[PDB]
Design a protein around this ligand. Structure first.
Ligand SMILES: *[C@@H]1O[C@H](CO)[C@@H](O[C@@H]2O[C@H](CO)[C@@H](O[C@@H]3O[C@H](CO[C@H]4O[C@H](CO[C@H]5O[C@H](CO)[C@@H](O)[C@H](O)[C@@H]5O[C@H]5O[C@H](CO)[C@@H](O)[C@H](O)[C@@H]5O)[C@@H](O)[C@H](O[C@H]5O[C@H](CO)[C@@H](O)[C@H](O)[C@@H]5O)[C@@H]4O)[C@@H](O)[C@H](O[C@H]4O[C@H](CO)[C@@H](O)[C@H](O)[C@@H]4O[C@H]4O[C@H](CO)[C@@H](O)[C@H](O)[C@@H]4O)[C@@H]3O)[C@H](O)[C@H]2NC(C)=O)[C@H](O)[C@H]1NC(C)=O
Lengths: 52, 62, 109
């Protein structure tokens, strides 16, 4: 979707358009979902031979 | 410390270099209209088309 | 005016060849010039002289991608080995331009 929008957004540096702010919000949210899923899987695959 | 600072075929004129400078240079190159000679103080870096000379005497860059 | 003094102020779109150092992009500063001179006459027939030490930016439209840091104009006298007492004149205006690195930090970095 970022690629899709790369050719339609003004190339000025006095502010960031609300649509790009929304896309970065969603992107960072997906990234944190990835991080916390890794954490959940790490907790799930623990055992007494490795962790107390 | 004293160099020539005139250009091309202009009447001769000299300058006193800064304290600690010992050299004098002579750049020559040709543009679309003719040949230019640049005389001054020091020894600079020149692009690979210029005839650069440097001398550590006095008034020896003519 | 009745004394013969002429003031002519025509518009122009200038497309100048400006070297672009890209070592520090998108945090780069550029030094772009505009060399002007009389084409067929030498400084003994047609002399030129700058009106002020630096360009007029009183009605300058702000850019959005660039910030004007400094600007100056310099006049040069050039003599050739062939012709000992004929100078060739030119005024060169330079503009030191700093880029605004927000679009590229939010979109690439
Ligand atoms: C961004 O990019 C820009 C473009 O690249 C870049 O611009 C450059 O900026 C620098 C400044 O930082 C500019 O350098 C200055 O240029 C001035 C103009 O130079 C030309 O004119 C000189 C004067 O010519 C007259 O006088 C001669 C005798 O003095 C005569 O022989 C001439 O015939 C002529 O006489 C006419 O005028 C007289 C008075 O007006 C009059 O009496 C007479 O009758 C007649 O009408 C020339 O000497 C000079 O030529 C030299 O340089 C060229 C190469 O450029 C050589 O090939 C020549 O052989 C020759 O050496 C130019 O044609 C200079 O005046 C100015 O010099 C002063 O400052 C320097 C500092 O280094 C001193 O070394 C120098 O002695 C001068 O000192 C005096 O003034 C300073 C303050 O200014 C002070 O110390 C003290 O008062 C001192 O007495 C200087 O060099 C440069 O030209 C720009 N380049 C351009 C525009 O292309 C810009 O910096 C960049 N920005 C960045 C990177 O930040």
């Amino acid at each position: 979707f970022l690629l899709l929008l790369a050719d339609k957004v003004p190339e000025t540096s006095l502010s960031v358009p609300i649509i790009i702010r929304y896309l970065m919000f969603i992107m960072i949210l997906v990234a944190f979902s990835v991080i916390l899923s890794v954490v959940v899987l790490n907790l799930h695959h623990r055992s007494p031979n490795t962790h107390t | 410390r004293i160099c020539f600072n005139h250009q091309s075929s202009q009447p001769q004129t000299t300058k006193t270099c800064s304290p600690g400078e010992s050299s004098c240079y002579n750049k020559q190159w040709s543009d679309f209209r003719g040949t230019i000679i640049e005389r001054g103080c020091g020894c600079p870096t020149v692009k690979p088309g210029i005839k650069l000379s440097c001398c550590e005497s006095e008034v020896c860059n003519n | 005016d009745y004394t013969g003094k002429i003031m002519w102020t025509p518009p122009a779109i200038f497309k100048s060849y400006c070297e672009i150092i890209v070592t520090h992009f998108p945090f780069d500063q550029q030094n772009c010039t505009m060399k002007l001179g009389i084409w067929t006459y030498d400084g003994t027939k047609v002399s030129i002289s700058p009106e002020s030490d630096r360009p007029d930016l009183s009605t300058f439209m702000e850019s959005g991608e660039w910030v004007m840091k400094d600007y100056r104009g310099w006049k040069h006298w050039v003599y050739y080995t062939c012709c000992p007492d004929t100078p060739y004149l030119d005024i060169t205006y330079h503009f030191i331009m700093q880029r605004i690195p927000l679009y590229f930090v939010v979109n690439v970095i």
